[PDB]
Design a protein around this ligand. Structure first.
Ligand SMILES: Nc1ccn([C@@H]2O[C@H](COP(=O)(O)OP(=O)(O)OP(=O)(O)O)[C@@H](O)[C@H]2O)c(=O)n1
Ligand SMILES: Nc1ccn([C@@H]2O[C@H](COP(=O)(O)OP(=O)(O)OP(=O)(O)O)[C@@H](O)[C@H]2O)c(=O)n1
Ligand SMILES: Nc1ccn([C@@H]2O[C@H](COP(=O)(O)OP(=O)(O)OP(=O)(O)O)[C@@H](O)[C@H]2O)c(=O)n1
Ligand SMILES: [Mg+2]
Ligand SMILES: [Mg+2]
Ligand SMILES: [Mg+2]
Lengths: 149, 149, 149
């Protein structure tokens, strides 16, 4: 049984030109790219993305830093929602484990390179917000017999 | 004092073509390749290899998954039996620490890329099972003065 | 709010020819190279560097291991003193976390590749010991807006 998570490379990942390195980390585990799209995030879509934080004082600056090119992604794998969060590491890079994306690439929470869904419910919500259903592609990885038990 | 451990790249490591990457992780610490052999594992030898698991429900599927090309290896280093196990990570890739082989490459325990000896006794037994003594090569690393205290 | 730490590649890092790999790990987080100098460490300066170990019985051997080429470095970043220590890993490579420098490259404490300042006071002392003020370079990283919140 596989699931799908929403992963988004933030404008700092684009501008520091580490998009390929990020994708490679997920491909390395045999996670399948089910969707991928470059767009420019706008305040209106970011308000819906960060709806849980509506009204808080840090949201305006969060929206400013996120207004920029982003890579929208959907990856598929076993337990991929929780596993992708583990691979990203703590929100605060200084607290993130060595070997995680945020520990390896970043210094502060406000520039922490990547977003990933925190639950099944948020993955469904975020994939619907950032993608049309035709953009989610169904295909099977040829190495499936050596990735899955 | 150094010791020797038995490490085996499983068929998923061969088929996903990450043999070199695996070897590089161990070379990176100054561990010495003492033996190396590509073979195709067969049920009879695998039954001896996994003798401790005799009777367990998962053994027949383990033997099936392991029937295939494997790279037999012996690496030498300080505390290398326990250290190689630490580098491999937990049996379940999803529980393994970021930066370990299983966390970085794998999803499920049944396809977790690599075997390593779990103790001094099992290392001795496994090395003798898969290698004849004439296959074990003794030489000194040129950088020994900078690897060992 | 950034600080500066003193990092030193030990003779084993020079001789194993992993200087560039070490530097890349720190550059990867957006840490700024503020100073860099190759020198051959002498017992006199090593005695002052390791003054906290004066009179102890392991000091003569530490100074001997360290008498050789070293790369003196100053890196700048948020919390970089503690963070560089985290990236280096425990003194004993066998105890260091996977994904740290010492865990990924080394076997024994006496050959553990790199030194880093362990506190604000030690960083100030060590930078001043190994560098004149004229050797510390002030410039701004062009990616600062994408590194710092
Ligand atoms: N005090 C805060 C709170 C959060 N953040 C930013 O806001 C994002 C959303 O906050 P949160 O959901 O708590 O962390 P993450 O889920 O890890 O962030 P994201 O959803 O974008 O992955 C964080 O990634 C972080 O960059 C911040 O800069 N300062
Ligand atoms: N419930 C289980 C138990 C184990 N395994 C498989 O059987 C192998 C041997 O089991 P075990 O010795 O308990 O784990 P490890 O020592 O981590 O595996 P290995 O000896 O091959 O290194 C595991 O690596 C794993 O591939 C499994 O698929 N399901
Ligand atoms: N019993 C000891 C004590 C220390 N060391 C060596 O002496 C250095 C300094 O010791 P210590 O300051 O206690 O460890 P670290 O701070 O991790 O080392 P460094 O200052 O060089 O970063 C260590 O890096 C290690 O190479 C050793 O070989 N064995
Ligand atoms: Mg979130
Ligand atoms: Mg075992
Ligand atoms: Mg110290």
């Amino acid at each position: 049984h596989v699931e799908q998570t929403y992963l988004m490379i933030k404008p700092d990942g684009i501008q520091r030109q580490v998009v390929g390195e990020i994708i490679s980390r997920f491909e390395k585990r045999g996670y399948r790219i089910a969707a991928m799209k470059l767009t420019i995030a706008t305040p209106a879509i970011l308000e819906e993305h960060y709806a849980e934080h509506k009204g808080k004082p840090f949201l305006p600056g969060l929206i400013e830093k996120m207004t920029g090119p982003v890579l929208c992604m959907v990856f598929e794998g076993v337990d991929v929602i929780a596993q992708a969060r583990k691979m990203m590491g703590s929100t605060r890079p200084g607290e993130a484990a060595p070997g995680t994306i945020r520990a390896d690439f970043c210094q502060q929470a406000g520039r922490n390179l990547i977003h990933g869904s925190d639950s099944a419910e948020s993955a469904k919500r975020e994939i619907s917000l950032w993608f049309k259903p035709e953009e989610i592609q169904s295909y099977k990885l040829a190495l499936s017999d050596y990735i899955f038990e």
